[PDB]
Amino acid sequence: EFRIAQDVVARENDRRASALKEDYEALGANLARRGVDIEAVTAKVEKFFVAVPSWGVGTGGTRFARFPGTGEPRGIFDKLDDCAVIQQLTRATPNVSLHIPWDKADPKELKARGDALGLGFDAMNSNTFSDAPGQAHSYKYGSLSHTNAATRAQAVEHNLECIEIGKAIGSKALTVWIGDGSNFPGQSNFTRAFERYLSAMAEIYKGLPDDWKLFSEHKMYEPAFYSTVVQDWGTNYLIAQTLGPKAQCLVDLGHHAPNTNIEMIVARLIQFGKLGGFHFNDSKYGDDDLDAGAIEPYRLFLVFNELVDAEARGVKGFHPAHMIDQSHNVTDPIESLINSANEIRRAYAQALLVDRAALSGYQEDNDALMATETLKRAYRTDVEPILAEARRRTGGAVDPVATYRASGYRARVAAERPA
Amino acid sequence: EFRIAQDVVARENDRRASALKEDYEALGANLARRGVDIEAVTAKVEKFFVAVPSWGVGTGGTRFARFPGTGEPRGIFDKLDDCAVIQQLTRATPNVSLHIPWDKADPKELKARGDALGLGFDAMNSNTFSDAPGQAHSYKYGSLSHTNAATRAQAVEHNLECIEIGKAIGSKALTVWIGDGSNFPGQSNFTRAFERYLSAMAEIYKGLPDDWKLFSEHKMYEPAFYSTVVQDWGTNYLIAQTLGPKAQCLVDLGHHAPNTNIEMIVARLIQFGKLGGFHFNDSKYGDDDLDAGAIEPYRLFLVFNELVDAEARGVKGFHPAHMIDQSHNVTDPIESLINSANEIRRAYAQALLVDRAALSGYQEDNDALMATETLKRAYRTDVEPILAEARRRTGGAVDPVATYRASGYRARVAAERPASVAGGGGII
Amino acid sequence: FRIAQDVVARENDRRASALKEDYEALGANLARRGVDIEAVTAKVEKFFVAVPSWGVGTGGTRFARFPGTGEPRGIFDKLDDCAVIQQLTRATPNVSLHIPWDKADPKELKARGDALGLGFDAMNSNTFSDAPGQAHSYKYGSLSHTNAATRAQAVEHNLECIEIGKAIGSKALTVWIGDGSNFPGQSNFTRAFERYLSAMAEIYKGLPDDWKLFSEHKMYEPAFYSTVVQDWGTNYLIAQTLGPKAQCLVDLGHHAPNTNIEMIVARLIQFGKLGGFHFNDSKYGDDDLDAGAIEPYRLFLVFNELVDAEARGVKGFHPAHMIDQSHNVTDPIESLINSANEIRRAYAQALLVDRAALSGYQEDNDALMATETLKRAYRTDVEPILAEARRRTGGAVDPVATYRASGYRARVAAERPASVA
Amino acid sequence: FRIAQDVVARENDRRASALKEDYEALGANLARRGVDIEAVTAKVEKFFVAVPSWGVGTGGTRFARFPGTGEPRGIFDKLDDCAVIQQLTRATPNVSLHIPWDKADPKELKARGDALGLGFDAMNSNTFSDAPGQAHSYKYGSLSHTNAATRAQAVEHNLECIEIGKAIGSKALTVWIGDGSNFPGQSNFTRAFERYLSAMAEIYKGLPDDWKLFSEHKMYEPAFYSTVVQDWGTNYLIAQTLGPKAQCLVDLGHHAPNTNIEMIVARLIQFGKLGGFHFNDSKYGDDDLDAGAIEPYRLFLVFNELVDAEARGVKGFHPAHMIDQSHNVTDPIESLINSANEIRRAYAQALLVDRAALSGYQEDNDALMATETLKRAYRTDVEPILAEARRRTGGAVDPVATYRASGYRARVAAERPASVA
Numbered sequence A: 001e002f003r004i005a006q007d008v009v010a011r012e013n014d015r016r017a018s019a020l021k022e023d024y025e026a027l028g029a030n031l032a033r034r035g036v037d038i039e040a041v042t043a044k045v046e047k048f049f050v051a052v053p054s055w056g057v058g059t060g061g062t063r064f065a066r067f068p069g070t071g072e073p074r075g076i077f078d079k080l081d082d083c084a085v086i087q088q089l090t091r092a093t094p095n096v097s098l099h100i101p102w103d104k105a106d107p108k109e110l111k112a113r114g115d116a117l118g119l120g121f122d123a124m125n126s127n128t129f130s131d132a133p134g135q136a137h138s139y140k141y142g143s144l145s146h147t148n149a150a151t152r153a154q155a156v157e158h159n160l161e162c163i164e165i166g167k168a169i170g171s172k173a174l175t176v177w178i179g180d181g182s183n184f185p186g187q188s189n190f191t192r193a194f195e196r197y198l199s200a201m202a203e204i205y206k207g208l209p210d211d212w213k214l215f216s217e218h219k220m221y222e223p224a225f226y227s228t229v230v231q232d233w234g235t236n237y238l239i240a241q242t243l244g245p246k247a248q249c250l251v252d253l254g255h256h257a258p259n260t261n262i263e264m265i266v267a268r269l270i271q272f273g274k275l276g277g278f279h280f281n282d283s284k285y286g287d288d289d290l291d292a293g294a295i296e297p298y299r300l301f302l303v304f305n306e307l308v309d310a311e312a313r314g315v316k317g318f319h320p321a322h323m324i325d326q327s328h329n330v331t332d333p334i335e336s337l338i339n340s341a342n343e344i345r346r347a348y349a350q351a352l353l354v355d356r357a358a359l360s361g362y363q364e365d366n367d368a369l370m371a372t373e374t375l376k377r378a379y380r381t382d383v384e385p386i387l388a389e390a391r392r393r394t395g396g397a398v399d400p401v402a403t404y405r406a407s408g409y410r411a412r413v414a415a416e417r418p419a
Numbered sequence B: 001e002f003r004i005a006q007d008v009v010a011r012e013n014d015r016r017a018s019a020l021k022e023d024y025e026a027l028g029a030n031l032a033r034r035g036v037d038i039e040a041v042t043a044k045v046e047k048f049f050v051a052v053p054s055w056g057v058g059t060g061g062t063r064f065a066r067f068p069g070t071g072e073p074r075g076i077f078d079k080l081d082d083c084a085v086i087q088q089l090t091r092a093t094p095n096v097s098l099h100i101p102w103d104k105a106d107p108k109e110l111k112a113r114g115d116a117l118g119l120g121f122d123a124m125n126s127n128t129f130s131d132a133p134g135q136a137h138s139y140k141y142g143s144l145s146h147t148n149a150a151t152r153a154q155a156v157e158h159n160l161e162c163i164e165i166g167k168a169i170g171s172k173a174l175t176v177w178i179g180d181g182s183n184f185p186g187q188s189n190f191t192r193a194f195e196r197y198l199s200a201m202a203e204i205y206k207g208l209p210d211d212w213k214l215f216s217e218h219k220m221y222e223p224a225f226y227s228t229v230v231q232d233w234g235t236n237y238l239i240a241q242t243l244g245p246k247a248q249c250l251v252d253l254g255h256h257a258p259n260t261n262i263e264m265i266v267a268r269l270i271q272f273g274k275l276g277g278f279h280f281n282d283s284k285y286g287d288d289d290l291d292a293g294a295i296e297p298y299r300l301f302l303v304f305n306e307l308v309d310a311e312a313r314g315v316k317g318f319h320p321a322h323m324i325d326q327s328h329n330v331t332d333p334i335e336s337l338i339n340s341a342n343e344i345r346r347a348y349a350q351a352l353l354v355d356r357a358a359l360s361g362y363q364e365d366n367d368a369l370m371a372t373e374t375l376k377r378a379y380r381t382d383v384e385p386i387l388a389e390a391r392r393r394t395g396g397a398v399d400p401v402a403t404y405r406a407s408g409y410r411a412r413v414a415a416e417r418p419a420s421v422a423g424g425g426g427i428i
Numbered sequence C, D: 001f002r003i004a005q006d007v008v009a010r011e012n013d014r015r016a017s018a019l020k021e022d023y024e025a026l027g028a029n030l031a032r033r034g035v036d037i038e039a040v041t042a043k044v045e046k047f048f049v050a051v052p053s054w055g056v057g058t059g060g061t062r063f064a065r066f067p068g069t070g071e072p073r074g075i076f077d078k079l080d081d082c083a084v085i086q087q088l089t090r091a092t093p094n095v096s097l098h099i100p101w102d103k104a105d106p107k108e109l110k111a112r113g114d115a116l117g118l119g120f121d122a123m124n125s126n127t128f129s130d131a132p133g134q135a136h137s138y139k140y141g142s143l144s145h146t147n148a149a150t151r152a153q154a155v156e157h158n159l160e161c162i163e164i165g166k167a168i169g170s171k172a173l174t175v176w177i178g179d180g181s182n183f184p185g186q187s188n189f190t191r192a193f194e195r196y197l198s199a200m201a202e203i204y205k206g207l208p209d210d211w212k213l214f215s216e217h218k219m220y221e222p223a224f225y226s227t228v229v230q231d232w233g234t235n236y237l238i239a240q241t242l243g244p245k246a247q248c249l250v251d252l253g254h255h256a257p258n259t260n261i262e263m264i265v266a267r268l269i270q271f272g273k274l275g276g277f278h279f280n281d282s283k284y285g286d287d288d289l290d291a292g293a294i295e296p297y298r299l300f301l302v303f304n305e306l307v308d309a310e311a312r313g314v315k316g317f318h319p320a321h322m323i324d325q326s327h328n329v330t331d332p333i334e335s336l337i338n339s340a341n342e343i344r345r346a347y348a349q350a351l352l353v354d355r356a357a358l359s360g361y362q363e364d365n366d367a368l369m370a371t372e373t374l375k376r377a378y379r380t381d382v383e384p385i386l387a388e389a390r391r392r393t394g395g396a397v398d399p400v401a402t403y404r405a406s407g408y409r410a411r412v413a414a415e416r417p418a419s420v421a
């Protein structure tokens, strides 16, 4: 079934078809002059997928306030309906990332709805950074690393429950992000808290299926404002290495200290086989959770440059889990996710354009200027025609947001859902 | 009224009196060898006050979750009862800073309760960074700088109402902090948004009594994550200078970019007569709103060094409105505010110990090492005895938190107030 | 001609076919967007940025300096090299001189410039290092030094820079100093600033009627605890205090981490104190890297503010544009060439923004379409426009490739002896 | 003796009375807290930190260096000055050498050291700068350079440092390089790191059985885009990969803004890879300022982690501490003296923490009392302890005061020719 009427998609595509053909053929000629087959690029782009977060489908907020828009999803099922629009139009988000207990519901029905909507399920996300109804022990002072054994045990069990839910819907991974840390010096004993966390994670790993992966996600601060147990990629590596082969690190772009060279962290994790995946978003100050590429698009490209280089170097068994993790506080969540997915494919596409042979030559000869210019020749290329054509060829929209607004989808759900 | 039984305070003070006398007398001798009269210091310390935020006596949270404790205050009246405890025990927080609409209530009752509790009222705080029930225009895309004229007018009207409430309870200032800004490049036109803000604030300024002050508070980011209209002290200065003599700038410790030299900003505002006041707290990453001095006590001292240097050089027309602005997410809010107020007096006391003449000499001689060492000799001095003695002589507790816990106050209000439920934050 | 004309012609011819195809393709695309590529090219070809005489030589850090071959031996060699950048990019007709590094007879400097087809931008004073025979050291400051005699000496040096500038055609004096402290208590923040203000008022006194005095703020380095002119707030107070001729200069790499620099630019413009820019890029501190090599979008956003100013019709708005970089691991000439290109690139893209649509989205608070409107301009590859602007004005379609084909570096390497001590 | 004994005795007696009063008063206060001041003093007088040979000379920035009087030239002058610091503070018995700056006949070095009462700590290699007559430049890197012969040269140099160290009593080699890139694409992050790991493996092979190899991470400078050994994560990967004799060095000012450094210290200790800590303070970047002059609490929190480990004696926890600072505006000797003092101060205060009480508040999640338990130790003025420790071990009650009374600076000023005067 189609959330967006097929005639609206066709109409909006036909209206822009002529211009797209002109832009695509022109770019094709330009790339051919550069020794690149535009068709080979498009083919790869239409294959690049990134999972959408269920928690990003509704309007987000801050500790200061939340300003909901119209037609806010009432639960996971409405969220899946809205996620179906993102996939239908961009064709880059076939899978949805669930968060428990927020999306708690009959797995069987979740699966049924997903299949009907043409959606799949990516990594499960546990939640021990907030208390649930009827919960016996509070996570106020931590969860997996809490000083109280009973609390750690409760956190572990919750994670195992997430695994059972995921197994029922076709998920093959569990992502663990906790707020565990301290707001005051002395509040926690850094080492003992980390020891407790490792012990609890070992239990989760013990209950992890052999066809699943376990992702730990580091974050410098927030909700903890002095120390955080899994504060950076260094601690994250120690975690993954200690836990086992099925345990890897997840890198969320907005979770690093100011000025951090994040693309280097990505390369380091790849070299040691611990790059489990990504949580895409953009930011300027802290963990802003803004639309990917909206603030520093070149950084996004540089991260993808390390991903594409890994293949070029011949790295094996490298299949990162790509996921979007954003908060949409002042825009229509669907439009933001649409353009964010587009931005991610944009950076990927540009990374594919890099002349690796030329770059390698300039790196060996220490020709810094030509090396950086080689990356820019790729980054400066406007790949929108390729992105648009990929969508068109796969059942999507030439201009996703334009088609979305032309459909009146938002007003529609605004009438079907409360206020 | 005495929130904390006098017998407990006396009991807990006598239990520590002997140790205090020994420490106080020892410190006094040391200071004497330093040409300092401990009594002169203690006298000023007893008179140093910092306002407490009404919204700070309740447990705070993040966008991810809130973990309330027991006996959470229901509203302004419970909050005043809790603030009274802080004042009774530390004697450093005689005034409370109200926030509207949160603390909206009959002005007469507020004033009545404050008087009974021995609490006065500091600067009023307006709220146009969130929407209230029945609100005609949403502040989602801004308030005083919103592109919609009606929305700005509504924001202006609200601020004027805050001034009316303040006049009825004894307040003499309005503090304006808004979230206005943008999350994406292009979303806002920086200049036009600021022009709109200046015009709206000019309307609020017109409603100020002659003995009132309007304080604008800058913040680099949050809730806006790309740009903020009142992002730094520079923009804040432009506001104060444009609005008028009664308009000044408020400096909130955690509202600056990483590595910012905050004490310099303080010195600059003082130099140009626009230091309206301070919003105390500490931080390590962003606007963490942590207990004052819990992360960087030296920085807190350095800020007070600028305050004392001015307070000494006569600098007339210098009466900064000091207030604590913190969020207590993992501690009993009352205990945190108590120790925070203590840390602020600690920094003050230490700044008072600085040998101004010696420092001036080293500055003129460019003796950087001795200059910084002159500051350290004051900072390194454990002034706890002075703080404890000041509290004792004014009806406070030698060890505030120890007395607070010995009184069983938290268990008391926990048994009088409805239970609270932990929940998520505004993230979803 | 520093670079042989036949080389430029040959290299331009070699790339003519591809340029035509890309330019005309871009022209059609822009036309579909209601933009006249010819109008953009006409503006781009007139956008100039001054080159720092001190950036033509290889730079270094406190840890080491690794010079390349043919390092300029003095200001005259530097002008010769600056002529190469201008001839090939046609984007840098003016040079920024630094005194005493570039001290020489004004008559000869002017004559050399005229002969090379170069002009002179704002003069730059130097009281952040000690020169031979100096009566007072700037170790503890200059214009804000506690010692009156030291400040007087600093003032006289700045007045001397104005005299030199008047003789060569300059119309401004840029003042950046290292004055500050490395320890709390070392300096009295207020008194230090007052001393600076008094010294600057004297310098202002020596300004011709058509001259400007630019003060440049910097968060830290060389001072590591406090700096007198630490940020734009202090900078604004300086310009407002000094007078009409005093304005603020924004050096991109001089701000605290995560600072929204484009907002500072907008604020200074609103209050008429944006004197000019020192373009460069950075990731950590005042890295002084090639403009746009690290955060090209930020560079674009700064230009978006400059162009919006023109759109809003700000009166008498003529910021002084200058590159202030250090080239530690590349051929200084090649980096300056590509840096000048990046600046014209960001400028060109800013010109492409559909202001009409943007204006609408800002009013309707359509944040997504507003940012997408900026992106549609930024994502456009304007290289064809930059290349055509150069072709039309006697420059090179691909500046660096032409520079390399000319063998210039090897030429000056043989002509210039490397310093031995 | 560098400083006349009668001067030391005179200035000590001058302050003996007040010191008695303060020490006895603190001893009483500590007794009421269940702490025996004598146990603290005994440990403090035994706490040492190596002094960098390159720290006694005036430091500079990329803009300038303002030398003071009596600047030490050569390792022999430097050792003479380092002897003053040790004699007065008794906290710096060992000096860390840097090759090739301090190159000299090992036997003469060992001799001068023994004569001055100074030992030698970790050796420090230098492949972040080029020495005259060098076959291959380190402009584009050293141990991770793309050119094999260049890496081989860097490796050989480090081995030579080990040979020098074995001859003078050293037991470790510290490796800090500037290797990195200033532009995206310039280096392939992974390949560069692979080359570095391979080169370090060769150096590791040259290590005696009782030697250690320390690698030092740094976020940036001299490289302003990427640095091979950029943080503790990469550093840990290096140490774990090389072997048991390889550990990581943590330099306070080499971290990203707001980094929780004390946690990094805890993590490395937990995994047995904390080789040592390089002390200094900072506010903006790698400012290399006097320890504790900016954030003394942070210094205390680092020692809180160190003392907690020293108490339990953790596996492989035997840190090799050193001061790594640059003194640009003070008498280097005085700064090193007060920096060593601050280090012992934070150590003494950390020793005062009631670990039992702390652990109790941590287990009950009583955050307020836990942080207050730390503060009760930190707020304690341990100067009386530091001064008594010095007095008992042949040092000065007030180091800097005694230094100034001795007229030492004026003395070496008369023996050493300044660059100009």
Ligand SMILES: C[C@H](O)[C@H](O)[C@@H](O)[C@@H](O)C=O
Pocket (backbone or CB within 6 Å): A055, A099, A125, A177, A217, A219, A252, A279, A287, A325
């Ligand atoms: C909801 C989700 O678990 C969350 O966003 C984490 O992944 C992390 O990004 C939090 O800062």
Ligand SMILES: C[C@H](O)[C@H](O)[C@@H](O)[C@@H](O)C=O
Pocket (backbone or CB within 6 Å): B055, B099, B125, B177, B217, B219, B252, B279, B287, B325
């Ligand atoms: C509640 C109060 O308005 C608020 O705390 C502001 O003062 C500012 O700190 C916000 O970040």
Ligand SMILES: C[C@H](O)[C@H](O)[C@@H](O)[C@@H](O)C=O
Pocket (backbone or CB within 6 Å): C054, C098, C124, C176, C216, C218, C251, C278, C286, C324
């Ligand atoms: C050389 C020139 O004066 C200098 O670069 C200043 O402009 C400033 O950028 C310093 O950081």
Ligand SMILES: C[C@H](O)[C@H](O)[C@@H](O)[C@@H](O)C=O
Pocket (backbone or CB within 6 Å): D054, D098, D124, D176, D216, D218, D251, D286, D324
């Ligand atoms: C000279 C010494 O190797 C150097 O200072 C390194 O240790 C590190 O501090 C670099 O910033």
Ligand SMILES: [Zn+2]
Pocket (backbone or CB within 6 Å): A177, A217, A252, A279, A325
């Ligand atoms: Zn995430």
Ligand SMILES: [Zn+2]
Pocket (backbone or CB within 6 Å): A219, A252, A254, A255, A287, A289
């Ligand atoms: Zn996050």
Ligand SMILES: [Zn+2]
Pocket (backbone or CB within 6 Å): B177, B217, B252, B279, B325
């Ligand atoms: Zn505040």
Ligand SMILES: [Zn+2]
Pocket (backbone or CB within 6 Å): B252, B254, B255, B287, B289
């Ligand atoms: Zn705040």
Ligand SMILES: [Zn+2]
Pocket (backbone or CB within 6 Å): C176, C216, C251, C278, C324
């Ligand atoms: Zn500059």
Ligand SMILES: [Zn+2]
Pocket (backbone or CB within 6 Å): C251, C253, C254, C286, C288
């Ligand atoms: Zn600079």
Ligand SMILES: [Zn+2]
Pocket (backbone or CB within 6 Å): D176, D216, D251, D278, D324
């Ligand atoms: Zn070091």
Ligand SMILES: [Zn+2]
Pocket (backbone or CB within 6 Å): D251, D253, D254, D286, D288, D324
């Ligand atoms: Zn350093």
